[PDB]
Structure formats: C-alpha cells, structure tokens
C-alpha cells in the first residue's frame, strides 16, 4: 500500500469552493437508487440513536462544548465511522459496537456507511439550505498516511485536508489549525498532549435561509436570566406552522419548515428553570397546523467538542488510548490529541404569537433521511 506525508500546514492551500461542494452534494443525492436512499435514511436514523445515547449518559451535556452549545449527530457518527476506516482488531471492534449499524459485514462496511452519510448531506441541500463538511487530518511532521485511508474519507466528504503539523508546541498547534481552517474555509473555529501525533477534526458549516421571515430592524431584549437581559437581532415570520403545547410537561414545540422534508424544531419551556428537564424529555428516543407569528433570535453560532468527551461513558478515550491499532491509517506511532467536531451554525432570514426571548432548544430534522442534523441549546444568542 502506498503512503505519503501530509504537506506541512504552512503550505499554500486554495480556499474550498462551497458552491462547488454544494453542486457535488446535490449530484450525490440525485443519482441514488432506492436501496441507497433507504441506506441514507437508515444511517440518519442510526446517528440519531447514537445521539440519544449521548444525551442519556449526560445530565448536563453542555459543559463538554466550547462556545455555542450545538451538536451534530451526523458529524459525530461520521467521525467515528471515519476513524473506523483506519482501525483494526480491538480498536475497530469497539468502534463498530458504538455505531451499531445492522448491516452484513463486507468487519463493518465503512465505505457504504460513509457514502450513506454524504447521501443524507446531499438530500438536505438538494431541497436556501447550505450544509458543508470538511475533514482535517492533522499529523505530526513526517507521519506517513496510507492512501486507501485518505481516499476512503473522500466518500464521507469530497473535501479532505491532510496536513502535517508540529504538536510539540501545543498552544501554537491549536492556533495553526484554527488559522489554517479559517483561512481555507472562511468560517470560525475552535480547538484544544505533547505526545500527540494525530488530530482528526471534522468541521461543518450550516446556513439556513427561512423564506417568509425577515431580519427586523430594531433588536429586542433576550432574557438570559430573569435578572440579566441582552438585545438581539430577531427574525420574524408568519405562516401555518406546526405547534403543540405540552400541558403535562409544561413546554411548547414549534416546527417551521425549511423545505417539504427538512424543518426546524423549537422547544420552549413554559418556565426558564425547566430548560434542563424539558431537554431530557425531548432529546430522547403530535404537532398540528396553526397560524403562528414567530419571533426568534437570528442565530450565528459557533461551537466545538471532542468526541472523547461526548462518548466518555462509552469509553471512547480507552478505545483511542489503550491497545490502539490505527494501522490502516498509518504505520507510524499514533497518539490521538483530539477528535474534534467544530460547528458553524447560521440561521438567517386567529394568530399565535410565539416569541423566543428566553433560553430554548432547537433541532434541524430531515424526513428524507430521517436524520437529526443538529441539536442545540441557545441560552444566549450572542457569544
């Protein structure tokens, strides 16, 4: 098997063309057979199962996230399926158990899974909606990457950027990865031992234009607490949006569509203190139409988390720091520094007045692939 040393992160890199990536993602969904389409929905449903498994083993899950408290079940499921591509023996087996894909072995068919995740990506944007995923494989200087592994990540996303980097100076390493990712994407990012020789980071950007809405001129006060308050630019739209008021669990849900299959969900607790408990009831394994005038904050959010913290209860840190065998990734010594997910989430522009001027929960769902693309919590629209 041939190899190659990732170019040093300081080398010239042309920026990624998102509009060219979107055309590719739509092409992927366009040429999907019936079996591949069901496989995409299947993997979207399986990523949800993993996501719900992550909310059950976390009382306060959001101390894991740096910045905006947004979470991508599809990206977490893809980062694990991507690492499995380079795993062997015990490491591969333990990763396979976490994914729980009920398909016949080709070991798990990592190529079919990753190609299914890119399918749920293309299904969403093929309907205004912008979803982009790029993977950065950051390695110590001189570490040899195996070609079949890099080429298989391209099944997850056409944009794969392997670069070599000096991890000895660590605080500078985190700046170079951010200064590199922002220079090549134009987004905002965040990141965080000295033995490390590999950092496998997924960076995804979502931009959702809701039609029928508009950015109001004057801001409105957003109450982070009953004591503290901040003014925020607000979106405003009116239409027949699905809704439901849960009197038993005292919370209300609003579903405003993006497309025929993709929608945004908004869980508003009746009282502010119920936020963490209302979250437990919703994010875990009934709406009807109503004329609603929705007013919610314009969301320009950025956050990041290490899967080793999300899946600490699944012993992922042990999977990646004990008996490690990523020898399909590289023959050289691998010490995982971070397994990152960095999310740039943008939400931009008789009667029931629904106003999100208090902490709320949200989610982006797509019925095409029955996939929770994003779960999140907005205690403060500004960060």
Residue numbers in the entry: 31 to 136, 141 to 161, 169 to 233, 238 to 330, 338 to 401, 417 to 450
Could you pull the original sentences from the published paper?
To further dissect the conformational plasticity of AGT, we then solved the crystal structure of spent AGT and compared it with that of intact AGT. The spent AGT retains a fold similar to that of native AGT with an r.m.s. deviation of 0.63 Å over 355 Cα atoms. Helices A, I, and J of spent AGT, which are involved in renin binding, have the same conformation as in native AGT. In contrast, there are significant movements in the CD-loop. However, it is notable that the rearrangement of the CD-loop in spent AGT places the side chain of Trp133 in the hydrophobic pocket occupied by the scissile peptide region in intact AGT, replacing the side chain of Val11. Finally, helix H in the spent human AGT is disordered with no clear electron density, whereas it is in a helical conformation in intact AGT. This may also be influenced by crystal packing; if helix H in spent AGT were ordered in the same conformation as in intact AGT, it would clash with the CD-loop of a neighboring molecule. A reduced stability of helix H in spent AGT could partly explain why spent AGT only has a relatively low binding affinity toward renin. The binding affinity derived from steady-state analysis gives a KD value of 13 μm, which is 640-fold weaker than the binding of intact AGT to renin. Therefore, we conclude that spent AGT does have a product inhibition effect on renin cleavage of intact AGT; however, it is unlikely to be significant in vivo.
